[PDB]
Design an enzyme around this catalytic site. Sequence first.
Site, short mmCIF file in Angstrom:
data_model
loop_
_atom_site.label_atom_id
_atom_site.label_comp_id
_atom_site.label_asym_id
_atom_site.label_seq_id
_atom_site.Cartn_x
_atom_site.Cartn_y
_atom_site.Cartn_z
N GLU A 35 0.82 -1.20 0.00
CA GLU A 35 0.00 0.00 0.00
C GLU A 35 0.86 1.26 0.00
O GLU A 35 0.61 2.21 -0.76
CB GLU A 35 -0.96 0.01 1.21
CG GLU A 35 -2.09 -1.02 1.15
CD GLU A 35 -3.09 -0.78 0.01
OE1 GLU A 35 -3.01 0.26 -0.67
OE2 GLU A 35 -3.96 -1.66 -0.21
N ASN A 46 -7.59 8.73 -6.06
CA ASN A 46 -8.36 7.74 -6.81
C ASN A 46 -9.11 8.41 -7.96
O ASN A 46 -9.36 9.61 -7.93
CB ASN A 46 -9.33 7.01 -5.89
CG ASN A 46 -8.61 6.28 -4.77
OD1 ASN A 46 -7.61 5.61 -5.00
ND2 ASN A 46 -9.11 6.42 -3.55
N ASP A 48 -12.09 8.42 -8.71
CA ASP A 48 -13.39 8.96 -8.30
C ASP A 48 -13.26 10.26 -7.51
O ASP A 48 -14.27 10.86 -7.11
CB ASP A 48 -14.20 7.91 -7.52
CG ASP A 48 -13.68 7.69 -6.10
OD1 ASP A 48 -12.53 8.08 -5.80
OD2 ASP A 48 -14.43 7.13 -5.28
N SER A 50 -11.67 10.61 -4.57
CA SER A 50 -11.29 10.37 -3.18
C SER A 50 -9.78 10.19 -3.14
O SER A 50 -9.12 10.12 -4.18
CB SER A 50 -12.00 9.13 -2.63
OG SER A 50 -11.57 7.96 -3.31
N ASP A 52 -6.44 8.14 -0.90
CA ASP A 52 -5.98 7.17 0.10
C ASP A 52 -4.78 7.74 0.88
O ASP A 52 -3.89 8.35 0.30
CB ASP A 52 -5.54 5.87 -0.58
CG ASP A 52 -6.71 5.09 -1.16
OD1 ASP A 52 -7.88 5.47 -0.93
OD2 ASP A 52 -6.47 4.06 -1.83
N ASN A 59 -9.13 5.27 2.70
CA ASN A 59 -9.80 6.06 1.67
C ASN A 59 -10.77 7.09 2.25
O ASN A 59 -11.54 6.78 3.16
CB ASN A 59 -10.55 5.09 0.73
CG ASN A 59 -11.07 5.76 -0.54
OD1 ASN A 59 -10.91 6.96 -0.73
ND2 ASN A 59 -11.68 4.96 -1.42
N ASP A 101 -15.59 -4.61 8.94
CA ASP A 101 -16.72 -4.11 8.15
C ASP A 101 -17.45 -5.15 7.27
O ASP A 101 -18.46 -4.82 6.65
CB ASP A 101 -16.26 -2.92 7.28
CG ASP A 101 -17.41 -2.16 6.65
OD1 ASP A 101 -18.13 -1.45 7.38
OD2 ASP A 101 -17.59 -2.27 5.41
N1 LIG Z 1 -13.49 -1.03 3.44
C1 LIG Z 1 -13.97 -0.46 2.35
N2 LIG Z 1 -13.49 0.72 1.95
N3 LIG Z 1 -14.92 -1.08 1.65
C2 LIG Z 1 -15.54 -0.55 0.44
C3 LIG Z 1 -17.04 -0.38 0.63
C4 LIG Z 1 -17.35 0.34 1.95
C5 LIG Z 1 -18.49 -0.29 2.75
N4 LIG Z 1 -19.69 -0.38 1.93
C6 LIG Z 1 -18.74 0.51 4.02
O1 LIG Z 1 -19.26 0.00 5.01
O2 LIG Z 1 -18.43 1.70 4.08
#
Ligand SMILES: NC(=[NH2+])NCCC[C@H](N)C(=O)O
EC number: 3.2.1.17
Length: 129
Positions: A35, A46, A48, A50, A52, A59, A101
Amino acid sequence: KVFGRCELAAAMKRHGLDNYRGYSLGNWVCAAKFESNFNTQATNRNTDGSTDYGILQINSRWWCNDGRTPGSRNLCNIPCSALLSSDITASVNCAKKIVSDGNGMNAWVAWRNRCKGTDVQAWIRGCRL
Ligand SMILES: NC(=[NH2+])NCCC[C@H](N)C(=O)O
Ligand SMILES: NC(=[NH2+])NCCC[C@H](N)C(=O)O
Ligand SMILES: [Cl-]
Ligand SMILES: [Cl-]
Ligand SMILES: [Cl-]
Ligand SMILES: [Cl-]
Protein backbone atom coordinates in the site's frame (compact mmCIF):
# COMPACT_ATOMS: atom_id res chain seq x y z
CA LYS A 1 8.09 8.39 8.61
CA VAL A 2 9.36 5.43 6.60
CA PHE A 3 9.28 2.40 8.91
CA GLY A 4 11.59 -0.55 8.72
CA ARG A 5 9.91 -3.93 8.18
CA CYS A 6 10.44 -5.26 11.73
CA GLU A 7 9.97 -1.77 13.22
CA LEU A 8 6.45 -1.58 11.75
CA ALA A 9 5.59 -5.15 12.74
CA ALA A 10 6.52 -4.16 16.30
CA ALA A 11 4.42 -0.97 16.22
CA MET A 12 1.44 -2.85 14.78
CA LYS A 13 1.69 -5.52 17.49
CA ARG A 14 1.90 -2.87 20.23
CA HIS A 15 -1.32 -1.33 18.87
CA GLY A 16 -3.08 -4.70 18.87
CA LEU A 17 -3.21 -5.47 15.15
CA ASP A 18 -1.50 -8.84 15.45
CA ASN A 19 -4.18 -11.46 14.78
CA TYR A 20 -6.89 -8.76 14.83
CA ARG A 21 -10.05 -10.26 13.26
CA GLY A 22 -7.91 -13.36 12.76
CA TYR A 23 -5.34 -11.73 10.49
CA SER A 24 -1.78 -12.54 11.51
CA LEU A 25 0.78 -9.75 11.84
CA GLY A 26 2.39 -10.77 8.54
CA ASN A 27 -0.82 -9.94 6.66
CA TRP A 28 -0.82 -6.39 8.03
CA VAL A 29 2.88 -5.83 7.29
CA CYS A 30 2.49 -7.23 3.77
CA ALA A 31 -0.52 -4.95 3.23
CA ALA A 32 1.43 -1.90 4.43
CA LYS A 33 4.39 -2.86 2.20
CA PHE A 34 2.36 -2.78 -1.02
CA GLU A 35 0.00 0.00 0.00
CA SER A 36 2.61 2.53 1.10
CA ASN A 37 6.09 0.97 1.06
CA PHE A 38 5.97 1.55 4.83
CA ASN A 39 5.72 5.34 4.41
CA THR A 40 3.26 7.05 6.78
CA GLN A 41 3.07 10.10 4.48
CA ALA A 42 1.94 8.19 1.36
CA THR A 43 -1.09 9.66 -0.47
CA ASN A 44 -2.69 8.57 -3.73
CA ARG A 45 -5.65 10.11 -5.57
CA ASN A 46 -8.36 7.74 -6.81
CA THR A 47 -10.16 8.15 -10.14
CA ASP A 48 -13.39 8.96 -8.30
CA GLY A 49 -11.80 11.95 -6.59
CA SER A 50 -11.29 10.37 -3.18
CA THR A 51 -7.77 9.98 -1.77
CA ASP A 52 -5.98 7.17 0.10
CA TYR A 53 -3.82 8.18 3.10
CA GLY A 54 -1.01 6.67 5.13
CA ILE A 55 0.66 3.32 5.75
CA LEU A 56 -2.54 1.42 4.94
CA GLN A 57 -3.92 3.81 2.28
CA ILE A 58 -7.25 4.46 4.01
CA ASN A 59 -9.80 6.06 1.67
CA SER A 60 -11.57 9.41 2.19
CA ARG A 61 -14.64 8.00 0.43
CA TRP A 62 -15.68 6.23 3.62
CA TRP A 63 -13.23 6.52 6.44
CA CYS A 64 -11.75 9.97 7.00
CA ASN A 65 -12.52 13.59 6.27
CA ASP A 66 -10.37 15.53 3.85
CA GLY A 67 -12.91 18.19 2.90
CA ARG A 68 -12.71 17.39 -0.80
CA THR A 69 -14.53 14.09 -1.37
CA PRO A 70 -18.17 14.90 -2.20
CA GLY A 71 -20.79 12.59 -0.73
CA SER A 72 -18.26 10.80 1.42
CA ARG A 73 -18.44 9.59 5.00
CA ASN A 74 -15.90 9.91 7.84
CA LEU A 75 -16.54 6.62 9.65
CA CYS A 76 -13.31 6.68 11.65
CA ASN A 77 -14.17 10.22 12.81
CA ILE A 78 -10.77 11.69 11.95
CA PRO A 79 -9.18 14.18 9.57
CA CYS A 80 -7.40 12.21 6.86
CA SER A 81 -4.23 14.09 7.85
CA ALA A 82 -4.12 12.12 11.13
CA LEU A 83 -3.44 9.09 8.95
CA LEU A 84 -0.08 10.55 7.82
CA SER A 85 1.39 10.93 11.31
CA SER A 86 4.64 9.21 12.33
CA ASP A 87 2.54 7.71 15.15
CA ILE A 88 0.44 4.95 13.59
CA THR A 89 -2.30 4.96 16.25
CA ALA A 90 -4.98 6.62 14.11
CA SER A 91 -4.21 4.37 11.10
CA VAL A 92 -4.42 1.22 13.22
CA ASN A 93 -7.64 2.21 14.99
CA CYS A 94 -9.22 3.01 11.61
CA ALA A 95 -7.91 -0.20 10.02
CA LYS A 96 -9.57 -2.13 12.85
CA LYS A 97 -12.92 -0.57 11.93
CA ILE A 98 -12.39 -1.26 8.21
CA VAL A 99 -11.45 -4.92 8.64
CA SER A 100 -14.47 -5.53 10.90
CA ASP A 101 -16.72 -4.11 8.15
CA GLY A 102 -17.64 -7.41 6.46
CA ASN A 103 -15.11 -8.24 3.74
CA GLY A 104 -12.10 -8.56 6.02
CA MET A 105 -8.79 -7.55 4.49
CA ASN A 106 -10.21 -7.78 0.96
CA ALA A 107 -11.12 -4.12 1.58
CA TRP A 108 -7.46 -3.52 0.67
CA VAL A 109 -7.17 -4.41 -3.01
CA ALA A 110 -3.36 -4.70 -2.77
CA TRP A 111 -3.69 -7.20 0.08
CA ARG A 112 -6.12 -9.28 -1.98
CA ASN A 113 -3.92 -9.11 -5.07
CA ARG A 114 -0.43 -9.41 -3.56
CA CYS A 115 -0.63 -10.82 -0.01
CA LYS A 116 -3.73 -13.00 0.25
CA GLY A 117 -2.83 -16.70 0.19
CA THR A 118 0.92 -16.03 0.17
CA ASP A 119 3.56 -16.84 2.80
CA VAL A 120 2.82 -13.67 4.78
CA GLN A 121 4.88 -14.98 7.73
CA ALA A 122 7.97 -14.05 5.68
CA TRP A 123 7.14 -10.40 6.41
CA ILE A 124 7.82 -10.77 10.16
CA ARG A 125 10.61 -13.36 9.84
CA GLY A 126 13.65 -12.59 12.01
CA CYS A 127 11.80 -9.79 13.82
CA ARG A 128 12.31 -9.57 17.57
CA LEU A 129 8.61 -9.38 18.37
N1 LIG B 1 -13.49 -1.03 3.44
C1 LIG B 1 -13.97 -0.46 2.35
N2 LIG B 1 -13.49 0.72 1.95
N3 LIG B 1 -14.92 -1.08 1.65
C2 LIG B 1 -15.54 -0.55 0.44
C3 LIG B 1 -17.04 -0.38 0.63
C4 LIG B 1 -17.35 0.34 1.95
C5 LIG B 1 -18.49 -0.29 2.75
N4 LIG B 1 -19.69 -0.38 1.93
C6 LIG B 1 -18.74 0.51 4.02
O1 LIG B 1 -19.26 0.00 5.01
O2 LIG B 1 -18.43 1.70 4.08
N1 LIG C 1 8.15 -9.02 -5.72
C1 LIG C 1 7.70 -8.79 -4.51
N2 LIG C 1 6.77 -7.87 -4.32
N3 LIG C 1 8.17 -9.50 -3.48
C2 LIG C 1 7.75 -9.34 -2.10
C3 LIG C 1 8.06 -10.58 -1.26
C4 LIG C 1 8.99 -10.26 -0.09
C5 LIG C 1 9.31 -11.45 0.82
N4 LIG C 1 8.09 -11.98 1.42
C6 LIG C 1 10.29 -11.05 1.92
O1 LIG C 1 9.94 -10.30 2.83
O2 LIG C 1 11.45 -11.46 1.91
CL1 LIG D 1 10.95 -4.68 3.11
CL1 LIG E 1 -15.46 15.74 2.00
CL1 LIG F 1 -11.80 16.82 9.97
CL1 LIG G 1 -12.29 -12.46 7.58
